[PDB]
Structure formats: C-alpha cells, structure tokens
Amino acid sequence: MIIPVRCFTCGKIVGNKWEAYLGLLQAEYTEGDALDALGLKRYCCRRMLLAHVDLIEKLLNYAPLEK
Amino acid sequence: MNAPPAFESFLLFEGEKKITINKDTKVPNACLFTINKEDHTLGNIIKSQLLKDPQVLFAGYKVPHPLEHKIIIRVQTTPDYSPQEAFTNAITDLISELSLLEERFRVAIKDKQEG
Amino acid sequence: QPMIYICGECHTENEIKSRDPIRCRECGYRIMYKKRTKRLVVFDAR
Amino acid sequence: IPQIGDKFASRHGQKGTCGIQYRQEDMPFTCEGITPDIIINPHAIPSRMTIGHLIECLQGKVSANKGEIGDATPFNDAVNVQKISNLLSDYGYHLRGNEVLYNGFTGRKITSQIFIGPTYYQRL
Amino acid sequence: PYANQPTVRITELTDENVKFIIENTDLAVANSIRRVFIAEVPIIAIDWVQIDANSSVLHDEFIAHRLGLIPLTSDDIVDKLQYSRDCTCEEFCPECSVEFTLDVRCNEDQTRHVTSRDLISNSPRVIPVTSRNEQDDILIVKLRKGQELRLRAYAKKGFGKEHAKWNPTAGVAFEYDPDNALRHTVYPKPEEWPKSEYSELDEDESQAPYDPNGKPERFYYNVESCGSLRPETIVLSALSGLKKKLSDLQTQLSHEIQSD
Ligand SMILES: [Zn+2]
Ligand SMILES: [Zn+2]
Ligand SMILES: [Zn+2]
C-alpha cells in the first residue's frame, strides 16, 4: 500500500525516494531518467520504484474511526 | 506455527557443543569435526585452507541439511600428521591471513582518504 | 467499567452500559466500535 | 509471512510451493550483487511450453532497466523476442536474459549462465 | 601449508560504497568475506515496538516491520553495545539497546508524512541515517487529519543471519576473473556477452585465453552501504567478525582436543 522501505532484493533504501520520484515525474522526467536521478542503478530498485502502486493515497480518502 | 527462531542458526543450545571430534574408522588418520551453529561461511574457508596443507590427504565439508544448523568437516592427513593438528593450523593460518588483510585494508583506507 | 464506544458515523466517544440498545447519543447511528485496548502488546519489528 | 509450503504462481500456470528459503548470502548472485527473489526449476518450462514466462522475464528486465512498463498485449507484431533482446543488449546485458551467477555458498561461478529477470509473481 | 599474504587496493571510497580489490587470497576466503558483509556484520536496528496509539491505515505489525527496516547509524556504538542475550539487565538497558520514541498527530488538512525524522532517540549517536546531517527521509506512514501514531521502539544489536534488517549492505557486487580465463563459466557464444567493467581485453577478443594453471585471485568488490555503517566500516567489521568466529572456533577446538 505504501512504498517499501528497502529493496526486496538488495536491501537498498527506497522509502525516501517515492516522493522525490513523483516530484521528478511531474518535472517532466521520463521514468528512466527519474530513476537515474535518484541513484537506482540496479534493475531491482528500479523495479521497486517503477512498479509501486501508492494505495495509501486511496486509503486516506476514508475518514478515520475517531475525529 | 513451525517457524524456528532466526537465532537458532547462530546460537548454541544449552549443553550443545560448538565442535565435536569423532575418529573416522574407515581410513587411518581421519577425523570428522561436527561444528554446530556454523554454515558455509566457516566451512568453506576451513576446507580450502586445509587443502593448502600438503600433509592433508582429504579435506571436505558438508551442511547435511540446510534446515539444520551444523556442518561436518572431514579431514584426513598423512600418518606423521594429525587431523586435529591440521584443523588447528588451518584456523591459525586463516586468522593470520585475516589479520593481515584487515591491517592492509586499514592502510588502504588511510591512503584513499588522505591521498 | 464504562465501556465507551465510538460512533461509526459521528465518531463520538459515548458510554453505553449493558442491556442498553446500541444507539449513539449524538446522531442515533446504530453501529459502534470498541476503542483500542490499553494493554501492552509488543511487536518484534520483523 | 511467506514460508515453506506456501503456494506461489506466475501469470503462466507456473504454480509451486516454497521448497526452502535461503538468506541473501546463500542465494546465487550476479556480478552486481543481485540475488533472485525466487528461483524456479528449469524443468517446469519444457513440457509446459510457457514461453510467455520467459518473454515476460526478458521484457521485464528491459522494462526495469529502461524505466517503462512492458507491453505484453497478446497479438502485437510491434513486439517480438528479437526486438526485446536487442533492447536488452543496449543496457549491458546478455541479449537473451542470461547472466553469470556465482554460487552463494562457495562464490565460484556457475558454469551455466542462468536466466534471471523480473517476473510478476502472485501469492495464492 | 600456511596462510595467504593478501594485498588490498581500494579503487573508490565514497560515503555510499567502497570499491576495492583483494589479491593473492583463496576464493573461499573471498566469498566468506562477501558473506560476512551481508550476514555477520552487526548493526543497530529497531527490534521491539510498543504501539500506544495507531489510527493510521496501516495495522500495527505493518508499522513495526516498517520501523525495523529503517537503518540507524551504528558506526561507533555497535561495538560498544551488547547483545541482549549477553546483557545482565532486564528486558532492556542502555548497554544493550537504544530507545526511540515517535509521536505524530495529523491535525492539519494536508496529509502528514510520518517519516524517519520523527523517530526521536535517547542516544544522539544512534539516529536514522536519513535524519543524519539531499536524500529525503524514509516514509513510515501517511496520516489523514484526525489520525495519530504514537509508539515506543527499542533498537538492538544483530546481524543479517537473524533478519535482513540487520544487514548493513545495499548490494555487494563480487567478481573474479573478469575475462573468463579460468573457464569457470562456459559461454556457448562468448561473443554475445558484454565485457566486465574490470575486463582488460581488446574489443575483438571476447574472453581471455584459457589458463590451465590458473587459480581464482584478484577478487573485485563493491560493497554498498545501506547507511548504518560506513562501507569501510562494513569491511573492517566483517574481517574482525570473521576473525573472531575463527578464534572462538579455535578456543572450542582446543577444549575438545585437550578434553580427549
Ligand atoms: Zn535493489
Ligand atoms: Zn453517532
Ligand atoms: Zn541490557
């Protein structure tokens, strides 16, 4: 639902790159160039950022249980 | 339900010996070293160091089961030598090699950070 | 002893005793949720 | 948490249970230290003829190295294996998706270059 | 019958990785060093969580697992701390553990990013790597107005054999014989394969001529750090840990030999 912390394969930290990745994408980067800007050179970490679906943004459309 | 704790690969159970030496009766001057809570990391280096000893006739290791956490190292030496002595010398040589490698890596790091 | 519940619609903390119809006092909604316990549950971050 | 006996499947009828789990130092690794998340047996391919599994693995390697999403729509003459291989050879990889792997236990190279790459797996 | 005299040559040293070469050592020694990089170099990581309040959309184990994988600077503290197995204290003490606290509440209308910057420690030396004084902070959870996350973690000493969260590496590239001179690989079509970055061959030549008398020497390493330890600290701690494994093994060996 949320960006993983580490890359499943190598263990590189990708948790701090989702927001930067999105900011680069709205900056008219291609996904490949964006992944290059964040330093994801192994195709495992590129897999992590490139195949992520941010479902938490949809789960935050529901009001919480307590106000 | 059946997951062993992850520390069981590294930690010795109470009353369980780290290493056990058993005389191999098939051939003379051979021993089996059953080392608990170790894996290929030490087995491979100990075997390969023992292979550098010309007085060692056989040096092999196996992890009998990956789900279990022991290794067995079989060492056969020449009659004038001993498998226990060979194993001891192999560990001593590995320790000296790693000490030298560590000191040289420290020197290389110092050179790289300085210039 | 109080067993305070939360409303599914108005999210109001309200106390309800046993043998009482399950009704929120602020909006009358019929579905209530218990609050998180105070007991100490521990997680190994694994 | 997935464990020995849990059933997993690709999108090509290739189902199987977890036989064993090895740590990252016990798994085989490429020259750049990438270990496989999953290792499946080559004997599951030939009788089954799930060549879509292999083409998907190769296309996925290209997609991950290129920063795109591969187009695996069934009947598409603009996408065949030779194009995907030519694309993969541009990213410094063997064009057919093979790599030299090293034995995780001993560190020696495996004589047979292994076919490795991203494939979409499912936990059942 | 005696030890190797390995030499070392570091070809790149940054804060993110160390690229070096070990020559005149056995392949087993090189691979055991590589394995210890991943599995027997201790670091500090969150291994105990107590959720006092979590109104977020991720359940408690999700948050706990996610906190465990945040790297914590472990450089000088990991050698000093003890394993909780070895500590003579109760569940915890400052000699075997580091206390973290996290307390965030989304009151404002925009989504609140609970990141690793919100992990407040009692020890200034052991902090989240991203929080260390660029790279953004690791995202623990996104909160909506009215959602709240309050927890209390304890970080422990461990290594990658127990859990990958105690693995300090973000990839260990290991290679040897870049030109296939030992023929430990057999390319069906050697011309089809790209050249290693460490290759010394003219482009017409696909692989080196076969060396019948050759042995694996000159192992190339690229140890990338997740952040907890410096890459050179990972290598030094790996060598020290392997040497202490061998020393303990020799001690137990001596007891077994003399007891017979
Ligand atoms: Zn990765
Ligand atoms: Zn109500
Ligand atoms: Zn303690």
Side-chain angles (χ1 to χ4, degrees):
Chain A
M1 283 73 74
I2 181 153
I3 184 70
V5 180
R6 317 290 198 82
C7 172
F8 299 133
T9 297
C10 58
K12 189 191 174 65
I13 296 87
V14 294
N16 53 5
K17 294 182 183 303
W18 178 243
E19 316 301 348
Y21 179 67
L22 291 174
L24 287 158
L25 291 190
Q26 75 192 36
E28 294 294 328
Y29 281 69
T30 61
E31 278 79 352
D33 300 334
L35 294 162
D36 291 331
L38 299 157
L40 307 181
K41 65 182 179 66
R42 289 187 284 284
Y43 64 89
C44 59
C45 318
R46 301 174 77 80
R47 171 274 312 270
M48 294 290 292
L49 265 290
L50 190 65
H52 176 245
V53 185
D54 209 21
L55 307 171
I56 193 166
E57 295 292 321
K58 295 291 185 290
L59 308 181
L60 292 177
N61 285 348
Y62 305 95
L65 175 55
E66 319 208 1
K67 71 209 297 186
Chain B
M1 173 163 304
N2 280 110
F7 59 77
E8 276 186 23
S9 49
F10 182 76
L11 298 186
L12 275 173
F13 182 75
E14 268 182 39
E16 182 65 26
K17 299 298 293 295
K18 182 54 166 194
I19 179 158
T20 297
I21 317 181
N22 294 309
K23 182 62 66 68
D24 200 339
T25 52
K26 296 183 289 294
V27 288
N29 282 114
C31 275
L32 280 296
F33 300 81
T34 312
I35 307 163
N36 279 293
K37 310 294 164 282
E38 313 274 8
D39 65 320
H40 305 261
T41 303
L42 292 193
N44 207 41
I45 53 172
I46 296 158
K47 187 265 286 167
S48 296
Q49 189 64 41
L50 279 163
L51 293 171
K52 293 181 68 168
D53 198 338
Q55 303 196 266
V56 162
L57 303 166
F58 187 94
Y61 84 107
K62 66 182 281 190
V63 182
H65 206 289
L67 298 183
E68 294 294 328
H69 313 105
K70 64 177 183 178
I71 59 177
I72 307 164
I73 306 178
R74 182 179 189 279
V75 189
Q76 191 194 355
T77 73
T78 57
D80 63 358
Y81 204 48
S82 178
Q84 292 98 333
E85 201 196 340
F87 205 85
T88 304
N89 300 141
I91 291 159
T92 304
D93 292 331
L94 280 164
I95 284 156
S96 86
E97 156 171 37
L98 292 169
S99 304
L100 189 75
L101 182 57
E102 185 185 348
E103 182 65 26
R104 291 179 181 184
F105 190 91
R106 289 174 184 283
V107 170
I109 289 291
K110 186 180 289 293
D111 291 331
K112 192 72 171 35
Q113 305 182 327
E114 294 294 328
Chain C
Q1 62 285 350
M3 295 298 102
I4 62 170
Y5 295 164
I6 316 288
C7 176
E9 184 178 1
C10 74
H11 317 71
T12 304
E13 69 276 16
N14 47 15
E15 194 279 334
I16 190 167
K17 289 289 196 295
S18 289
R19 306 297 218 291
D20 188 354
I22 302 299
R23 200 169 155 90
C24 179
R25 67 181 65 252
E26 190 276 331
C27 67
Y29 193 58
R30 283 273 146 71
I31 304 164
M32 318 280 279
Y33 296 95
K34 296 197 79 170
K35 291 175 71 175
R36 198 205 167 96
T37 189
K38 298 293 183 182
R39 222 173 289 188
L40 295 175
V41 65
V42 162
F43 301 103
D44 61 334
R46 297 202 192 188
Chain D
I1 292 163
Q3 64 193 33
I4 292 176
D6 282 7
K7 207 206 264 178
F8 299 80
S10 80
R11 293 178 285 171
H12 310 278
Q14 289 299 326
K15 48 170 169 177
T17 62
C18 183
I20 208 174
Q21 277 165 347
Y22 288 125
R23 294 183 290 276
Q24 188 189 338
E25 80 286 0
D26 281 325
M27 290 283 265
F29 55 105
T30 72
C31 60
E32 50 176 0
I34 286 170
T35 57
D37 289 295
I38 292 160
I39 312 177
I40 66 166
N41 199 236
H43 296 86
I45 314 311
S47 52
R48 272 74 172 285
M49 321 189 265
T50 48
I51 310 315
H53 189 300
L54 310 178
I55 304 164
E56 190 217 344
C57 185
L58 193 73
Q59 177 77 96
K61 206 177 228 184
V62 174
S63 300
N65 282 280
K66 180 168 185 301
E68 63 164 10
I69 300 296
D71 193 14
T73 314
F75 323 107
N76 190 10
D77 296 332
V79 169
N80 54 299
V81 162
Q82 198 65 51
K83 292 199 204 316
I84 303 160
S85 301
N86 293 333
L87 285 160
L88 190 54
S89 66
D90 306 350
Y91 296 107
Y93 285 109
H94 187 242
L95 79 169
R96 306 295 177 200
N98 287 75
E99 304 195 43
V100 173
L101 296 188
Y102 294 67
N103 194 54
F105 305 124
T106 62
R108 185 202 184 287
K109 300 188 192 184
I110 291 153
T111 309
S112 181
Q113 296 90 47
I114 302 305
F115 180 77
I116 184 169
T119 311
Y120 198 73
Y121 262 65
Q122 315 169 296
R123 194 192 184 193
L124 309 183
Chain E
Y2 290 119
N4 298 288
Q5 263 77 35
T7 60
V8 193
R9 184 158 39 89
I10 302 183
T11 68
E12 183 180 357
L13 182 57
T14 64
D15 312 290
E16 169 262 320
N17 73 326
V18 61
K19 193 187 278 190
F20 59 101
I21 310 170
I22 306 179
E23 314 197 23
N24 309 331
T25 196
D26 199 77
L27 170 58
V29 180
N31 186 58
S32 282
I33 288 157
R34 183 205 73 77
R35 290 167 64 86
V36 170
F37 293 159
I38 295 156
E40 285 94 2
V41 165
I43 58 172
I44 312 302
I46 283 159
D47 197 65
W48 187 97
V49 187
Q50 213 194 29
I51 314 285
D52 309 326
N54 175 22
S55 313
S56 75
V57 300
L58 311 180
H59 58 272
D60 302 337
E61 293 95 328
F62 203 100
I63 301 296
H65 175 266
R66 172 159 281 262
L67 285 174
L69 291 169
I70 289 161
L72 313 174
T73 62
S74 311
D75 280 276
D76 61 289
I77 301 299
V78 65
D79 308 76
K80 293 149 64 173
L81 294 174
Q82 306 286 117
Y83 292 101
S84 288
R85 319 182 281 273
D86 309 336
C87 204
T88 192
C89 76
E90 66 273 17
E91 193 65 25
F92 305 121
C93 71
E95 302 298 283
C96 76
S97 162
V98 178
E99 191 200 299
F100 287 80
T101 300
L102 188 147
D103 184 347
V104 184
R105 190 186 277 97
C106 189
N107 53 295
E108 201 268 329
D109 291 331
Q110 287 70 61
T111 302
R112 168 53 189 276
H113 289 257
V114 184
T115 58
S116 54
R117 181 161 298 294
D118 298 325
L119 264 173
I120 309 308
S121 56
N122 72 3
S123 177
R125 296 248 51 75
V126 187
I127 51 154
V129 175
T130 59
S131 160
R132 178 177 56 195
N133 288 26
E134 60 278 18
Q135 73 196 354
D136 208 351
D137 281 289
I138 296 150
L139 170 73
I140 294 162
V141 59
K142 306 184 190 180
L143 296 175
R144 155 174 186 140
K145 184 178 184 293
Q147 292 181 349
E148 193 260 340
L149 179 57
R150 172 162 34 82
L151 54 87
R152 191 169 69 96
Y154 277 112
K156 292 283 183 79
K157 188 183 173 191
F159 39 73
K161 279 227 294 196
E162 204 178 351
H163 198 267
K165 77 190 184 188
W166 283 303
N167 176 12
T169 63
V172 184
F174 169 84
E175 180 165 8
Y176 70 87
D177 195 63
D179 315 324
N180 194 32
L182 311 180
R183 293 288 194 280
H184 281 197
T185 46
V186 175
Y187 301 130
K189 310 197 219 187
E191 59 268 11
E192 280 180 344
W193 285 81
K195 304 288 195 69
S196 167
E197 68 193 56
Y198 311 105
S199 173
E200 68 275 16
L201 283 198
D202 206 67
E203 308 307 333
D204 53 304
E205 195 171 4
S206 49
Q207 47 178 345
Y210 165 74
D211 191 301
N213 320 115
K215 197 151 181 93
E217 312 283 26
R218 186 137 55 240
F219 311 91
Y220 307 85
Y221 289 86
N222 202 350
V223 180
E224 186 184 344
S225 176
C226 73
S228 315
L229 296 167
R230 293 182 184 271
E232 66 272 20
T233 307
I234 294 165
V235 180
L236 285 196
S237 175
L239 293 159
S240 313
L242 189 53
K243 187 158 72 76
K244 299 289 94 175
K245 286 171 75 77
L246 291 153
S247 301
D248 291 331
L249 182 59
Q250 210 173 207
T251 300
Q252 289 321 111
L253 182 52
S254 66
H255 293 88
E256 269 283 311
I257 290 160
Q258 76 205 14
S259 79
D260 190 45

